[PDB]
Design a protein around this motif. Structure first.
Motif, short mmCIF file in Angstrom:
data_model
loop_
_atom_site.label_atom_id
_atom_site.label_comp_id
_atom_site.label_asym_id
_atom_site.label_seq_id
_atom_site.Cartn_x
_atom_site.Cartn_y
_atom_site.Cartn_z
N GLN A 1 -11.79 -4.09 2.58
CA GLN A 1 -11.18 -2.79 2.30
C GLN A 1 -9.72 -2.74 2.77
O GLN A 1 -8.88 -2.16 2.07
CB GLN A 1 -11.97 -1.65 2.95
CG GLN A 1 -11.67 -0.27 2.38
CD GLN A 1 -12.40 0.01 1.08
OE1 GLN A 1 -12.93 -0.91 0.44
NE2 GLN A 1 -12.46 1.27 0.69
N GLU A 2 -9.44 -3.31 3.94
CA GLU A 2 -8.06 -3.42 4.44
C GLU A 2 -7.45 -4.73 3.93
O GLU A 2 -6.39 -4.70 3.33
CB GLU A 2 -8.01 -3.35 5.97
CG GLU A 2 -8.29 -1.96 6.55
CD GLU A 2 -9.77 -1.60 6.56
OE1 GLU A 2 -10.11 -0.47 6.15
OE2 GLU A 2 -10.57 -2.46 7.00
N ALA A 3 -8.15 -5.85 4.16
CA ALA A 3 -7.67 -7.18 3.73
C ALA A 3 -7.82 -7.37 2.22
O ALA A 3 -6.83 -7.54 1.50
CB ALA A 3 -8.39 -8.30 4.49
N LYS B 1 -12.17 -8.97 9.50
CA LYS B 1 -12.10 -7.58 9.04
C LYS B 1 -12.77 -7.39 7.66
O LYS B 1 -12.98 -8.36 6.93
CB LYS B 1 -10.64 -7.11 8.97
CG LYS B 1 -9.95 -6.97 10.32
CD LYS B 1 -8.52 -6.47 10.19
CE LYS B 1 -7.88 -6.27 11.56
NZ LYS B 1 -6.44 -5.88 11.51
N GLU C 1 -3.69 -8.12 4.75
CA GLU C 1 -2.73 -7.66 3.75
C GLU C 1 -2.25 -8.70 2.73
O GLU C 1 -1.44 -8.37 1.86
CB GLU C 1 -1.48 -7.07 4.41
CG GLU C 1 -1.62 -5.63 4.85
CD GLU C 1 -0.29 -5.03 5.28
OE1 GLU C 1 0.45 -5.69 6.03
OE2 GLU C 1 0.01 -3.89 4.85
#
Lengths: 101, 135, 90
Positions: free
Chosen positions: C21-23, C18, C24
């Protein structure tokens, strides 16, 4: 008894490993203890090459916020009972320490 | 049946409810339905065992019946499921705690006696008084 | 760009599921001050080309000359390549 210990004013205790050089010079530990004044004696468990050492700190007294903010780094802090408090029979007292049990 | 042994009184009466695969209390049942499933299978495998029940008529054989529909519960956690909590009281907590699990302790709590402690020792009073000490 | 110590890098690389921007697992960022810039710079250099190149099956047949509407290239092996991509050409 257990409730006499748990009620008596607690103190901060960090358990640092042997791995830390002196001529950096170990100012990192001193810098991070400076920012959070208060009234909690700081204890240091140094697991040396032979024997578990006990080291109460010096002038710095933590204000019970520096526990969580220190665990953010690679150190394992605790809110252990203060050793120095264990004496006397007033202030608490021994009656009031039986109440929570 | 290892879960059915762990049975700590009313502990497993909720356990059967919580990781379910039932059908809205399940008609003609019972809880667990996972008691019948290994009786149908007949552990370990065993050819002369899972045939028996299918011929009269683990998980796939259990899914092959079956009272599925409903869909209630999931985990294993999920839910359903002077000082005091307080304030008031939800949960989520609105005074002390938690970095839960602690959340979960306030939902089984209500109400409305303080202390105790029960089960028993012994920190719910301390964390309460300690939480009042910082005004 | 050569394969030198990927000791802590492979550990940091294996945290990604991924885009950054996202990478929790971002709790690794608060630990050291060095690795704050590595990630922040990396995510700033994420979507950027990165070069290239040609399409395995991509072929265009225009009615009027390509050079009137679509600009051209020529790859290493000597193929006339379109400067626009799949979507832009369609």
């Amino acid at each position: 008894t257990l409730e006499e210990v748990l009620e008596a004013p607690k103190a901060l205790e960090v358990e640092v490993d042997h791995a830390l050089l002196d001529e950096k010079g170990v100012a990192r530990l001193k810098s991070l203890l400076d920012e959070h004044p208060g009234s909690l004696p700081v204890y240091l468990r140094v697991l040396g090459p032979f024997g578990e050492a006990l080291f109460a700190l010096r002038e710095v007294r933590v204000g019970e916020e520096a526990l969580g903010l220190l665990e953010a780094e690679g150190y394992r802090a605790y809110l252990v009972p203060d050793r120095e408090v264990f004496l006397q029979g007033n202030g608490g007292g021994p009656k009031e320490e039986v109440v929570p049990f | 049946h290892h879960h059915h042994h762990h049975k700590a009184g009313e502990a497993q009466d909720l356990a059967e409810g919580w990781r379910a695969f039932l059908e809205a209390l399940k008609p003609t049942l019972r809880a667990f339905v996972r008691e019948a499933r290994p009786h149908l299978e007949g552990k370990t495998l065993v050819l002369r065992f899972p045939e028996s029940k299918a011929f009269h008529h683990l998980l796939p054989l259990a899914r092959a019946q079956f009272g599925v529909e409903e869909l209630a519960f999931v985990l294993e956690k999920k839910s359903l499921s002077p000082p005091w909590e307080a304030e008031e009281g939800e949960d989520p907590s609105e005074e002390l705690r938690r970095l839960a699990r602690l959340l979960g302790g306030r939902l089984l709590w209500v109400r409305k006696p303080k202390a105790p402690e029960a089960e028993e020792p012994v920190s719910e009073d301390g964390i309460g008084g300690n939480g009042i000490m910082p005004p | 760009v050569y394969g030198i110590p990927h000791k802590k890098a492979e550990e940091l690389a294996k945290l990604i599921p991924k885009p950054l921007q996202e990478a929790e697992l971002r709790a690794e960022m608060e630990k050291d001050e060095r690795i704050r810039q590595v990630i922040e710079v990396a995510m700033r250099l994420e979507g950027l080309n990165r070069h290239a190149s040609v399409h395995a099956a991509g072929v265009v047949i225009a009615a009027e000359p390509l050079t009137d509407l679509v600009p051209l290239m020529r790859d290493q092996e000597g193929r006339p390549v379109t400067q626009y991509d799949m979507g832009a050409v369609e």
